[PDB]
Amino acid sequence: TIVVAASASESAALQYLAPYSGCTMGEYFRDRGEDALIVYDDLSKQAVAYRQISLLLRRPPGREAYPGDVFYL
């Protein structure tokens, strides 16, 4: 197992990027004819970190103050 950590005290940018970093580490095996499994323990916490950055960048809010592109995230 590879363990990727972005704990509660870390920058909202690191919490927003952690799932993509872990996905990239899993994709290494897929692209080379091997099998991998990935667990995202909380995508709802990744969405809350993305909402923070987006509001501080002054982008217009949506359905529960969440960014317009939270589906595409």
């Binding site: 217009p60 949506g62 359905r63």
Partner: protein, 57 residues
């Protein structure tokens, strides 16, 4: 004795069903207050979201 007990069963049931009807109304009354609270809360939240988006765009 049997026949009189059957008359008692009918009267007792009349009271049981009156009580059940009254109790149902009380639950309906309590739920309607929770419904009105939810109705008013839904309106305020939507307005905040409309105002919030318009204050950015």
């Amino acid at each position: 004795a049997v026949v009189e007990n059957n008359a008692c069963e009918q009267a007792a049931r009349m009271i049981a069903m009156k009580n059940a009807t009254d109790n149902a109304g009380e639950l309906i009354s309590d739920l309607q207050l929770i419904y009105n609270k939810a109705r008013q809360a839904a309106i305020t939240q939507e307005i905040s979201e409309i105002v919030g988006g318009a204050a950015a765009v």
